[PDB]
Each structure stands twice: as C-alpha cells, then as structure tokens.
Ligand binder design. Structure first.
Ligand SMILES: CC1CCN(CCOc2ccc(C(=O)c3c(-c4ccc(O)cc4)sc4cc(O)ccc34)cc2)CC1
Ligand SMILES: CC1CCN(CCOc2ccc(C(=O)c3c(-c4ccc(O)cc4)sc4cc(O)ccc34)cc2)CC1
Lengths: 223, 229
C-alpha cells in the first residue's frame, strides 16, 4: 500500500514517474495544441498508474479521476515549465506563445492571462520540483473524488483521503528539510493548495470553450 | 489593523460578522431560490465589510472579490447549514429540499449531489463553526485574487495585503487545531483536507454559474459604494 511509504519514498516515486517535456509537431494553432495535448495524455495515463495509491482504485474510478483532472494536470505542467519565461507560456520548447498569440483563438485570452499569473506566482514562491510533483499528484487524486453513495464508493474515498494525507506529510517534510519554520510550513502549504483552486477554475473555463470523453479515456486506459 | 489581530481576535471578529439565516419568501422553486439568493447577497456584503482586511482594499477590488466569490459563499453557507440534515439541503429553515426536488429543475441534480456530498464531507470531518468562518473568509479573499485585471503598483500592494491576511487566517486555523489537541501531523493534514474542499466549492460555483446563465458588477458596486450619511 502507498500508505506505508515514507515521505522520501513518496517523493522518489513521484520524481521517477515524471513524464518528459514533449515537443510540438510542425488556426494551425489549435491543431498544434490539440496534437500536443493528446500526446501528453498518453504519458499522463502512464504517470497516473505510477502515482502511489492510484491503481488500487477500480478501473471505473481511475477513469473518473483522469476525466476530471486531465486538463488541470496539463495546465499545472504548462505553468511549471513557463516559470522562467515571464510573459510567455511554454507549451513546448518549440512552442512558446504570448497572450497576443493567445488572442488568436476564441476566449482563451483571459485564461492565458490567468495561466501567466499562476506561473508568476510559482516563480515568486520559488516552487521546487519536489513540491510540484506532490501538487500534481494531489490534483489527480482530489479533482474527481467528490463526484464518483454505495459502500464501495465509501471505501474508494477513504483510500484517496489517506493517500492525500500521505502527500500532505510529504509536502511538509520537503519544507522542513528546506529549513522553513513550522509557521512558514503551514503558510506555504495553504498558499499552494489555494493555487489548486485557481487551477480548478482555469480548467473549468478551459473546458467551456474547448466544447463521450469518459469512454475515450476508458479506451486509452485500457489501450 | 487586521494584521495585528491574534488568532482568538480573528475568530471572535469572524463569528461576530456572520450574516443572519433568511427564510424562503412564501419553476416556483427557481423563483424561490432566486429571491432567497438575492436577499442573502445584501447581507453578504455587510458580512464581507467585517472580514478583517476587506475594507482596506479599493472599492473596485472589493467588488471584484465579491463578483468572483459570491456563489461560492452562498454554497458553503448552504453546506454548513445542511450538515445536521443528511440527504437534504437546507436552503432556508422553511426550505429543506432533497435531491429528487433538484430534478424538478433544468440540470441542477448534479450540483445538488455535489452539494450534499460536501455537506457529508463536513459532517464526516466534524467541521467546527470556528473553522467554517475562516474557510468562508478564505474564499472571499482568494477567489478573485488571481484575476485582478492590472499589475499596477497599487494592485501589487492590494495583492500583498490579501496574501498577508490569508496567511493570518491560515495561522488561525492551525491555532484552532492545536487547541483541539491535534498533533502537528494531524493539524497539517486537516488544514490540507479543508483547503482541498475549496477546490470542489470553486468547481460547484463554476458549474452553478453555467446552469444559472443589470450586470452583477453594477449591483455589487452600488451596494458596496455606501455614503457616510
Ligand atoms: C481523450 C481526449 C483528450 C483531449 N483531446 C482534445 C485536445 O484537447 C485540447 C486542445 C487544446 C488544449 C490547449 O490549448 C492547452 C491549454 C489551454 C486550453 C484552453 C485555454 O483557454 C487555455 C489553455 S493548457 C495546455 C497545456 C498543454 O501542456 C497542452 C495543451 C494545453 C488542450 C486540450 C481529445 C481526446
Ligand atoms: C445581485 C444578483 C445576484 C444573483 N441573481 C440571480 C439569481 O441567482 C441565483 C439563483 C438561484 C441560486 C440557487 O439556486 C442556489 C444554489 C445553486 C445554484 C445552481 C445550482 O446548479 C445548484 C445550486 S446554492 C444556493 C445557496 C443559497 O443560500 C441560496 C441559493 C442557492 C443562486 C443564485 C441576480 C441579482
């Protein structure tokens, strides 16, 4: 069980599960981002399976979690790799775009600015890679949890909450190691989890304009 | 002022600021729900003005925060007062609805279920009143925070102040947990659990907004822009 892993073992599992940074393959704009996202999703599915506690869930529940988190997950990766590129979003090393090039779509402008603002927040906070991988894991486990009343669902949520607790402990550990005081540790933990609400929001806004999916992701998880 | 408060002072100030519980005035049901929400907004504004640090902000920034947070705030109040009624949503003491009453309206069963689920979660965690008021204040200060239109010096000043207040509220939550006997581990875990629930509350507001949809901006503005007569 994921529940007996030490903090160091958890960080180390998450660091080893990290997908690679993918490249763009080249109006053409949405085609290029569509193609990049779809390739990313294949690696995300494999990363998911390596997140401690994830394959303990039913196949149905795994698919639910991925259906609910996949865009937030692409967004937090985007924002992470954009940290060192103020004013720009590094979709791929060969696809670094600004809000002006974001205007080139329909409605994504304001979301572009939101993504840019999250990136600045991370840079400002000096988010570490070890912290980022825990955040990503938290999104995967958390996003779909409150939308799976049977007894089995009740077991599924309890497991997720215990794995989530383990990831909280891991985050606090990293901060402790980094030399922050206890007051700085609770404050930074809160600040990062609050950013996860903003990521949920950007994801919702992203979904409204990019528009079943569950079935598509089921075929993928199977494949 | 707000930044000098102790945790105990923050909590008293938050408990003192709570709005009243309103009654339903009597789809008949969407008309009822709409009237209720409209009347609660007026009190929500008075409550927001008593949230430590809120009235230090510009009028424009106050309006933005409420425009971003208002449905989140109505929802978390709903979930809080639904806690003692498993399976039901207490919109008002004379308006307790179950999930099947949601279907009687165009597309809200999914949100209904999400709301009951959050209520159950709060129940399952034994959420305290003191923790509830901190969470509601966090929502207000956080929801519109990363959507300020500008990166002006003033705006930078505003953002910094809100982050300092948010840190204070986090300090106060930890404070309540330390006094309830929780170990450091349990304190950080419970903190995280509660903050993750805000992510779901955001989601529910966004979905609720889609389903629901004089511009709201103008109405909060008029309502918040009070004379001193
Ligand atoms: C099983 C299905 C999976 C999805 N397929 C459709 C493919 O969808 C997508 C098409 C485009 C984008 C996108 O533009 C991306 C982001 C975004 C979206 C909306 C918005 O307003 C602002 C930004 S962030 C981001 C990060 C990346 O690393 C990669 C892409 C994006 C995203 C998805 C269909 C098959
Ligand atoms: C100044 C403006 C303010 C808004 N007016 C428009 C009208 O607004 C609203 C109309 C209805 C509802 C609502 O039904 C409520 C909730 C909800 C919303 C959507 C959904 O899918 C499921 C539940 S939760 C909740 C909690 C309450 O205490 C009170 C109501 C609700 C909410 C707002 C117009 C004037």
């Amino acid at each position: 069980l994921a529940l007996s892993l030490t903090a160091d073992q958890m960080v180390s599992a998450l660091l080893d599960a990290e997908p690679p940074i993918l490249y763009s393959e080249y109006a053409s704009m949405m085609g290029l981002l569509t193609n990049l996202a779809d390739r990313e999703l294949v690696h995300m599915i494999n990363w998911a399976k390596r997140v401690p506690g994830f394959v303990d869930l039913t196949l149905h529940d795994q698919v639910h979690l991925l259906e609910s988190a996949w865009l937030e997950i692409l967004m937090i990766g985007l924002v992470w790799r954009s940290m060192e590129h103020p004013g720009k979003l590094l979709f791929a090393p060969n696809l670094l775009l600004d809000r002006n090039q974001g205007k080139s779509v329909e409605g994504m402008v304001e979301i572009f600015d939101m993504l840019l603002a999250t990136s600045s927040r991370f840079r400002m906070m000096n988010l570490q890679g070890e912290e980022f991988v825990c955040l990503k894991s938290i999104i995967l486990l958390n996003s779909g949890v409150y939308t799976f009343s049977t007894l089995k669902s009740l077991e599924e949520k309890d497991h997720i909450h215990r794995v989530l607790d383990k990831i909280t402990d891991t985050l606090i550990h990293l901060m402790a190691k980094a030399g922050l005081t206890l007051q700085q540790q609770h404050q930074r933990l809160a600040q990062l989890l609050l950013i996860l609400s903003h990521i949920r929001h950007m994801s919702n806004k992203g979904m409204e304009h990019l528009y079943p999916l569950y079935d598509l992701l089921l075929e993928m998880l199977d494949a």
